[PDB]
């Protein structure tokens, strides 16, 4: 009745964002993806583009720093003598096979492809055109604009006055399952009512009853529960949460079946009255719980208390022993550590710390209540409080902060943030949504605004959301919210994504099929479970889910393999759909739960952007993994690269110095003295850079099978099993990396500056403790093994050391460097 009414009323503002977005606007609805960009600090490029009319491609050398704009009327000054009358505007610049267009007002150096290809040094392969010439099959239309959206596949007491007692009578659940009136002998429900993701009032526990006389479908409890507080107490975000237990039969202690919660104001901030049905889930059961509220002759509504319209100014009292101690606690890493006693200090000195708008979550974690009286204050801070950082707002989005004008305040400073930077972020985005109660949120709409504006930010969410529906909890809420993204998206993007889910669910097939057959059958298994990948791309031409710029035409079945391990995960090898693009190699897995390993690689290359934004490039490999539904997704395969354990075997059968296996490795496809150079100083900066993740997200399963190299020198890892297991050397260095970094037996100055990197990009991340620690926190909800509690962050914590200072913790990972080396510590210094 209510919750129909906040989905109608969802649609209604969803058909009033779609107005700020016409399909005529090609900023907004381009068609085509964006390469991606990484703001570098600011160098000579080679580039290769091709030209219609040429029959060879024009190659010259680009400044990095210089902007795409330019480069692509360097490209046509090579063309024409004087571009006067060739329209300059009309021209873009793509990615060769890539269905991706590079950002005119962005530095050739920023964009990740660039990045990928110098750390590579592969070629820049780029096509000038036309917008006409260009794919837009993505771009909305008039039809998309006018098309509504569907989502689908009287007396008043003000809420301050109200001095009645919050009580409810928990009647009945039905429709319990035959193995549940089998194990169990009584049920009874656990009652907590909570604000910012914590308890107001201790638990309160119902009767254990069993099922009602004459009917084993229900449990009738019919019992009143009367908690210790006021209608006038509750804040505007209150929930009561309500789990089932069930006493087992004598044939352990209780078992928590299921979880339930009620928002006691809705959409429209009315009290909750009358009977209300919550649905918990169990095993693709639905189970109907009823709570009767009160309902007397007149609405309780929640009114906010009256602005504070107040202006502090500039002249305050100045106390400098004060000063000292508000400075220390201002310029601290995190919240985290934060004790009572510097909680009443910086919230009695909140109004001095106005200049420094980044600590705002400190001074908020530090509030005595959010009593309605002690409101006003709050938010006349909040509205006169300078814009904050959209990394440091991102803390005001997790569970602590449950208040609307906090987090609309948040999701207003967020704005400011880049597409480029967010298409990183979305996960820790999307599970921020669980910690809006109300489907209409400042957050939901700030997400469809930018999917709406970018076509990545957009497939990104897609596959996240997707994921998201599989919560037991939360899976009707992401329900409606990708129901509103499909919608809004057009048919275009909509025909296209269900071409990507219908692959990932024939690649699904094949994959469990190869993996539930014999040795002398997989083979065959494989070659005639792929007919049926081999007709859907005979009708169809598939975009990769995993990057959505290559567009599969066929498939290679005589390339096509098994990788002959745990889980045997599927080489997939299909063919470009352009001729200028290359071969598309993916990796598709089943039975392994890929987002633990989605979520290592994000926090890998979240360091990266961090070095580079410090203009320190550590040579990262970093590649794409999907989860494309429930343990199950594609991985990006980086080609000509083997594991140190092969490596090890293959070069301890030739030689016995087990000393040079990974060197006499890089010199055969690293001949010259000069290309070998490179090749070890390509190992140097990322084997610092892999040294360093590995300590900091903690992760001691960092073997000879766990640990890859690339031919062109990279080390990177591919295996996140282990991950935040900071429960314990924490990396390896063998006496065969030690040989490659020195370049000879004996130390010299490279292992110095291998030494420089690992502490320099160390204090980095230290820098940045505040963001690792709330992109942790954001992911907590998501159900992942070794992530589930704030406790899980304090290790992260502690390995970044926030209390020394860059001296300290330069000494501190340069003892953690010398003890690795371990037996062969001793040759060093
Ligand atoms: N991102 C990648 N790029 C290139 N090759 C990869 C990548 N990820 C895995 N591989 C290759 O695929 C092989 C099998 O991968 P898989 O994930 O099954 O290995 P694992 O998790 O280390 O081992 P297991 O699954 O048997 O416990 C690896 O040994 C490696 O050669
Ligand atoms: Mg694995």
Not at 2 to 17: G, R
Not at 670 to 688: G, H, L, Q, T, V
Request: proline residues 4%.
């Amino acid at each position: 009745a209510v919750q129909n009414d906040e989905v109608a009323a969802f649609c209604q503002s969803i058909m009033k964002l779609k107005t700020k977005f016409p399909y005529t606007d090609h900023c907004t609805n381009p068609g085509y993806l964006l390469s991606p960009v990484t703001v570098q600090r600011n160098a000579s490029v080679k580039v290769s583009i091709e030209i219609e009319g040429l029959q060879l491609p024009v190659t010259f050398t680009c400044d990095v720093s210089s902007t795409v704009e330019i480069i692509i009327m360097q490209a046509l000054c090579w063309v024409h003598d004087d571009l006067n009358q060739v329209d300059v505007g009309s021209y873009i610049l793509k990615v060769c096979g890539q269905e991706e267009v590079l950002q005119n007002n962005h530095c050739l150096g920023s964009h990740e492809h660039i990045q990928n290809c110098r750390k590579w040094d592969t070629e820049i392969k780029l096509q000038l055109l036309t917008l006409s010439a260009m794919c837009q099959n993505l771009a909305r239309t008039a039809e998309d604009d006018e098309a509504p959206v569907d989502l689908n596949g009287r007396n008043i007491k003000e809420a301050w006055t109200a001095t009645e007692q919050l009580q409810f009578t928990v009647y009945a659940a039905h429709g319990i399952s035959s193995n549940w009136v089998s194990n169990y002998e009584k049920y009874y429900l656990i009652c907590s009512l909570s604000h910012n993701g914590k308890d107001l009032f201790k638990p309160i526990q119902s009767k254990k009853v069993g099922t009602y006389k004459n009917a084993a479908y229900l449990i009738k409890w019919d019992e009143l529960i009367i908690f210790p507080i006021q209608i006038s107490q509750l804040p505007l975000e209150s929930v009561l949460h309500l789990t089932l237990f069930g006493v087992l039969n004598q044939s352990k202690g209780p078992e928590a079946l299921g979880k339930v919660s009620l928002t006691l104001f809705d959409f429209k901030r009315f009290l909750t009255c009358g009977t209300k049905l919550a649905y918990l889930w169990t095993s693709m059961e639905r189970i109907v719980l009823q709570v009767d509220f009160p309902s007397p002759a007149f609405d309780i509504i929640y009114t906010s208390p009256q602005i504070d319209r107040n202006i502090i100014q500039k002249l305050e009292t100045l106390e400098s022993d004060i000063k000292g101690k508000l400075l220390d606690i201002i310029h601290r890493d995190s919240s985290f550590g934060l004790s009572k006693e510097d909680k009443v200090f910086l919230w009695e000195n909140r109004y001095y710390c106005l200049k420094h708008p980044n600590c705002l979550p400190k001074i908020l974690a530090s509030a005595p209540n959010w009593k309605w009286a002690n409101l006003a204050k709050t938010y006349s801070l909040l509205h006169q409080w300078p814009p904050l950082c959209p990394l440091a707002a991102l803390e005001l989005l997790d569970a602590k902060f449950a208040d609307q004008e906090v987090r609309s305040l948040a999701v207003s400073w967020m704005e400011a943030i880049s597409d480029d930077e967010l298409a990183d972020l979305l996960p820790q985005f999307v599970q921020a949504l669980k910690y809006e109660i109300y489907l209409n949120s400042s957050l939901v709409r700030f997400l469809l605004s930018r999917a709406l504006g970018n076509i990545q930010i957009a497939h990104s969410l897609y596959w996240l959301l997707k994921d998201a529906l599989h919560d037991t909890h939360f899976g009707s809420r992401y329900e409606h919210v990708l129901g509103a993204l499909l919608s809004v998206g057009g048919k275009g993007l909509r025909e296209e994504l269900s071409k990507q889910m219908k692959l990932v669910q024939l690649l699904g097939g094949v994959a469990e099929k190869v993996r539930q057959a014999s040795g002398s059958t997989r083979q065959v298994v494989l070659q005639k479970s792929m007919e049926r990948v081999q007709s859907f791309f005979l009708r169809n031409k598939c975009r990769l889910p995993l990057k959505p710029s290559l567009v599969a035409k066929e498939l290679n079945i005589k390339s096509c393999s098994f990788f002959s391990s745990n889980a045997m995960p599927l080489k997939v090898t299909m063919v470009n759909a352009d001729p200028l693009g290359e071969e598309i190699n993916v990796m598709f897995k089943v039975g392994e739960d890929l987002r633990q390993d989605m979520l290592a690689l994000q926090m890998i290359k979240i360091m990266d952007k961090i070095w580079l934004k410090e203009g320190l490039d550590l040579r990262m490999v970093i590649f794409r993994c999907l989860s494309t539904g429930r343990d199950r997704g594609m991985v990006e395969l980086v080609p000509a690269s083997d594991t140190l354990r092969k490596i090890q075997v293959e070069y301890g059968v030739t030689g016995s110095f087990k000393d040079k296996p990974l060197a006499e490795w890089l010199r055969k496809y690293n001949p010259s003295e000069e290309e070998y150079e490179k090749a070890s100083e390509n190992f140097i900066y990322s084997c610092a850079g892999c040294c360093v993740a590995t300590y900091v997200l903690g992760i001691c399963d960092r073997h000879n099978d766990n640990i890859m190299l690339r031919s062109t020198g990279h080390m990177f890892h591919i295996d996140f099993g282990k991950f935040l297991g900071h429960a314990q050397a924490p990396f390896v260095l063998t006496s065969d990396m030690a040989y490659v970094i020195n370049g000879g037996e004996k130390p010299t100055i490279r292992f110095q500056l291998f030494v420089d990197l690992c502490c320099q990009a160390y204090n980095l991340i230290r820098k940045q403790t505040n963001l690792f620690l709330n992109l942790l926190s954001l992911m907590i909800p998501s159900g992942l093994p070794e992530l589930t509690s704030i406790q899980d962050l304090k290790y992260v914590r502690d390995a970044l050391q926030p209390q020394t200072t860059d001296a300290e913790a330069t000494i501190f990972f340069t003892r953690l460097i010398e003890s690795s080396l371990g037996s062969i510590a001793t040759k060093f210094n």
